[PDB]
Amino acid sequence: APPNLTREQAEQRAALLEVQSYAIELDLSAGAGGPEVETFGSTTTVRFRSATPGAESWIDLVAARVRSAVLNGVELDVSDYDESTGIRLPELAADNELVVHADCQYTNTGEGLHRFIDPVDGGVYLYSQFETADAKRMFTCFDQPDLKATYQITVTAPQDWKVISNAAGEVTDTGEGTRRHVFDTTKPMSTYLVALVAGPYAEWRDVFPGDDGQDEIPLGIYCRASLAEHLDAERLFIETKQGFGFFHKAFGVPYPFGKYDQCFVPEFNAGAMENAGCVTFLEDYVFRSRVTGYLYERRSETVLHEMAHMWFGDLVTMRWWDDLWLNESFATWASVLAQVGATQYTNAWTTFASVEKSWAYRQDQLPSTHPVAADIPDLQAVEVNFDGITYAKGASVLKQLVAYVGLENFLAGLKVYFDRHAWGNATLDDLLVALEEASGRDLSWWSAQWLQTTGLNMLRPKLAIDDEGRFTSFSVLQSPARPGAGEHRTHRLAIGIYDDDPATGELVRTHRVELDVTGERTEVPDLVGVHRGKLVLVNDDDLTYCTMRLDPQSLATLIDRIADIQESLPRALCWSTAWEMTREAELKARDFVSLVLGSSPTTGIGAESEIGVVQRVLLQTQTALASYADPAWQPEGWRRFAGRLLELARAAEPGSDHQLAFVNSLAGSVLGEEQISAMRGWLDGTAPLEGLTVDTDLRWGLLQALVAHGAAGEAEIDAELERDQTATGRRRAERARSLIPTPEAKEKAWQRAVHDDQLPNAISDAIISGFQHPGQRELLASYVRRYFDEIDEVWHRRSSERAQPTVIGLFPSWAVDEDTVAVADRWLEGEHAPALRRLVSEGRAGIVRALAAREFDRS
Numbered sequence: 031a032p033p034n035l036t037r038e039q040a041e042q043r044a045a046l047l048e049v050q051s052y053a054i055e056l057d058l059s060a061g062a063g064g065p066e067v068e069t070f071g072s073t074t075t076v077r078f079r080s081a082t083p084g085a086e087s088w089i090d091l092v093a094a095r096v097r098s099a100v101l102n103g104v105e106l107d108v109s110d111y112d113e114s115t116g117i118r119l120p121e122l123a124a125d126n127e128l129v130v131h132a133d134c135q136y137t138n139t140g141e142g143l144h145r146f147i148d149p150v151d152g153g154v155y156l157y158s159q160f161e162t163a164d165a166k167r168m169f170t171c172f173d174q175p176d177l178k179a180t181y182q183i184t185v186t187a188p189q190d191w192k193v194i195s196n197a198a199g200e201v202t203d204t205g206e207g208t209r210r211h212v213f214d215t216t217k218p219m220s221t222y223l224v225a226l227v228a229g230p231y232a233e234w235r236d237v238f239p240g241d242d243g244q245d246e247i248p249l250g251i252y253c254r255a256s257l258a259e260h261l262d263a264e265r266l267f268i269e270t271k272q273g274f275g276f277f278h279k280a281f282g283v284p285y286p287f288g289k290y291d292q293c294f295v296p297e298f299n300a301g302a303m304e305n306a307g308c309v310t311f312l313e314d315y316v317f318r319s320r321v322t323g324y325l326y327e328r329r330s331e332t333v334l335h336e337m338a339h340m341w342f343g344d345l346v347t348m349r350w351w352d353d354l355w356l357n358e359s360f361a362t363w364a365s366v367l368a369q370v371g372a373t374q375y376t377n378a379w380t381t382f383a384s385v386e387k388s389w390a391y392r393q394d395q396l397p398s399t400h401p402v403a404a405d406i407p408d409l410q411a412v413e414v415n416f417d418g419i420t421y422a423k424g425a426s427v428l429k430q431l432v433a434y435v436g437l438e439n440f441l442a443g444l445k446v447y448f449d450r451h452a453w454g455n456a457t458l459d460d461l462l463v464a465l466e467e468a469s470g471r472d473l474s475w476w477s478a479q480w481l482q483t484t485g486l487n488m489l490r491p492k493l494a495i496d497d498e499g500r501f502t503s504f505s506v507l508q509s510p511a512r513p514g515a516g517e518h519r520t521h522r523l524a525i526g527i528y529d530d531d532p533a534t535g536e537l538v539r540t541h542r543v544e545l546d547v548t549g550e551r552t553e554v555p556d557l558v559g560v561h562r563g564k565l566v567l568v569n570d571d572d573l574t575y576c577t578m579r580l581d582p583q584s585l586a587t588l589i590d591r592i593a594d595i596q597e598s599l600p601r602a603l604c605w606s607t608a609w610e611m612t613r614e615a616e617l618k619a620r621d622f623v624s625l626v627l628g629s630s631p632t633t634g635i636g637a638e639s640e641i642g643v644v645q646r647v648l649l650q651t652q653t654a655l656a657s658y659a660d661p662a663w664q665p666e667g668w669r670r671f672a673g674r675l676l677e678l679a680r681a682a683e684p685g686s687d688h689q690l691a692f693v694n695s696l697a698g699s700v701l702g703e704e705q706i707s708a709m710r711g712w713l714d715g716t717a718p719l720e721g722l723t724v725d726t727d728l729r730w731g732l733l734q735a736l737v738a739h740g741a742a743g744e745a746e747i748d749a750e751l752e753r754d755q756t757a758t759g760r761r762r763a764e765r766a767r768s769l770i771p772t773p774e775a776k777e778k779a780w781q782r783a784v785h786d787d788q789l790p791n792a793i794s795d796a797i798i799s800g801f802q803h804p805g806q807r808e809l810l811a812s813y814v815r816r817y818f819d820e821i822d823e824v825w826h827r828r829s830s831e832r833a834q835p836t837v838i839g840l841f842p843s844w845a846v847d848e849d850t851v852a853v854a855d856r857w858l859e860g861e862h863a864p865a866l867r868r869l870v871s872e873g874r875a876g877i878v879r880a881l882a883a884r885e886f887d888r889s
């Protein structure tokens with residue numbers, strides 16, 4: 031039970047102490063032994079200064095036992111030691127020295143010095159993970175980011191093992207089964223950035239050739255042995271080299287640490303870690319299969335994300351953890367800049383927009399949303415106060431800060447900031463000021479608008495044109511931020527005009543204006559007299575964080591010309607804007623489906639190069655068919671859609687994501703005779719779609735589609751169960767059982783689902799998962815009113831954790847009716863648990879929204 035350091039405790043210790051250097055010795059000789067090994071030898075010698083001689087302080091440590099601890103000559107009383115209390119340090123001198131001999135535990139969790147035995151070759155692999163505060167599990171330290179120091183690490187290793195750390199080292203053979211690894215003293219670092227990576231790791235090497243004031247850099251890659259066959263080292267070294275050439279130009283600071291080693295470590299909890307000069311990666315980035323291009327891009331971004339930290343995080347580190355959002359956010363942004371600037375992934379801002387940004391917007395519109403910047407009063411707070419929104423929205427708003435300051439200014443203040451604060455600590459405000467100095471902007475209000483609030487502002491353009499089509503006036507209307515306080519933020523955004531390219535007839539940008547948008551209305555005089563083209567795009571370049579609307583004329587053009595938009599970022603914004611206008615009843619549902627389907631499989635989404643956007647659009651199109659479309663037009667809608675899914679898939683590249691995407695969409699769609707015919711053929715080899723590999727997942731999905739339409743019965747599911755029985759498989763089979771279209775099958779599920787008292791929680795969700803379908807609306811009418819009637823008693827019956835998914839999942843979002851809305855209010859009358867009402871409220875709103883759009887579609 032390690033200590034929950036508080037912001038105050040850290041501030042007080044930071045006030046009093048200044049740490050100079052750490053000397054660490056570790057006995058890892060017993061490490062290559064078997065599971066009975068539980069401890070290792072950690073001897074820490076720390077030199078530090080105190081500015082109130084005679085005061086009492088404390089140093090952090092988490093160990094099995096403490097052999098001895100000797101402050102300034104005196105042997106200290108370790109009899110009472112507990113990890114939650116560390117080591118009190120009374121009678122401090124002005125200059126102190128502490129030596130501590132202890133025995134630390136290896137771990138099997140993510141934290142501290144983690145230990146793993148490869149079940150295949152029996153070899154033992156060690157790695158460390160110290161963020162936020164696990165450094166104390168290896169050595170004695172003041173474990174808080176603002177007491178930086180240099181480290182001199184020496185390890186005694188089994189002789190088969192390599193030992194990688196922050197700095198480069200030298201090895202001398204001990205000839206007793208071991209080797210001794212002495213690593214250079216490092217430059218100053220925080221405790222959680224210290225690395226130790228020890229084992230029989232496969233090892234490559236390469237070097238980034240030095241240039242432009244940047245010295246050469248020794249690079250290496252490591253991974254377990256078994257995994258070494260699948261390591262594309264060549265590729266990784268090219269992407270590492272692209273990054274090092276980019277970042278020192280951009281930042282104006284050469285790589286601060288000596289070499290750059292990157293290790294792929296087993297059982298890694300956190301994906302990647304930016305230990306200085308020793309970056310760690312989870313094993314999923316070692317591609318063991320023919321792998322999709324999105325995975326390469328994602329991996330490329332991840333490598334770049336950690337490399338960025340060398341400067342921002344490792345060279346200048348925060349003071350306390352409430353700047354953790356800024357640290358990761360900046361890195362996220364820097365790595366998309368690098369990808370676009372120096373890698374093959376020149377479409378990176380598009381990916382960012384459809385993946386991280388879209389996700390941020392989705393989260394930020396729910397009632398769960400919270401601001402980026404949270405108060406972090408103690409260490410435990412970090413884990414609960416910063417979540418995905420923090421990071422997804424953090425990156426997106428830092429991108430807008432870059433736009434507002436201006437990129438060249440921003441990069442210019444980065445240099446001031448890295449030089450001003452290098453090998454030291456720094457706050458948000460320390461960086462806002464550097465940026466004020468570089469650009470003359472006033473950012474005193476910025477955090478209060480963007481980091482401390484929630485919700486999105488809408489931007490709608492207000493325009494007028496003359497007989498010639500040239501703007502006579504152009505204003506941007508900003509709406510209050512919702513959900514939230516309702517403030518109007520300040521944006522730097524661009525506006526782009528798109529017109530036919532005479533040579534190709536494709537929509538290309540013919541004009542671009544940038545401006546500060548402020549308050550509830552902003553004028554755009556740079557557009558007066560400019561021809562309005564065919565498409566007017568506010569928030570072009572996706573520089574700001576908002577909800578955008580298209581004018582009526584641009585909207586009409588889009589329906590018939592979206593695939594002709596030459597660039598992917600503008601084309602992705604319109605896919606986004608069209609869906610948001612469908613959600614809000616400004617784009618008729620039927621007209622969104624027409625946007626999506628296009629004239630041909632070569633127009634609309636059939637033409638979208640971007641896999642992320644295709645997936646989202648396909649998913650959103652289904653949602654528009656099931657809920658926003660009008661019942662009269664809906665039967666046709668589904669046929670048109672499943673018709674197009676089928677052609678799109680029978681046209682896509684063979685192992686392509688796009689081909690897979692069209693299959694998976696067809697799977698969840700409502701099908702006609704041919705669709706079922708072809709799909710049935712795909713599970714069999716009767717008529718395989720070429721290149722379409724059918725794994726269990728896809729096979730199960732295809733069957734779930736077959737079974738859901740009556741084309742496949744219980745027997746068909748049952749045999750697939752013989753083909754595969756797994757924890758995942760039972761669930762997958764259970765979902766199929768629930769989908770069969772018969773009241774008896776549904777009746778079984780409601781009771782089994784709602785009422786399986788003794789059913790595993792895995793299975794409950796899988797029983798509900800298949801309980802709904804776009805095409806069984808008639809088959810579910812009974813459960814509309816009964817869910818409301820029943821839920822009360824299950825809420826009182828089941829636990830908090832179990833009950834909420836059942837209410838959310840079985841909420842009758844399939845019945846979009848005034849009747850069902852009326853029933854929601856009817857249920858709403860009786861007093862019920864606030865948490866139960868909390869769900870019915872979210873749930874009811876979805877039905878209401880769907881009904882207003884159902885209506886606009888009729889309009």
Ligand SMILES: [Zn+2]
Nearest residue numbers: 335357358361
């Ligand atoms: Zn990060």
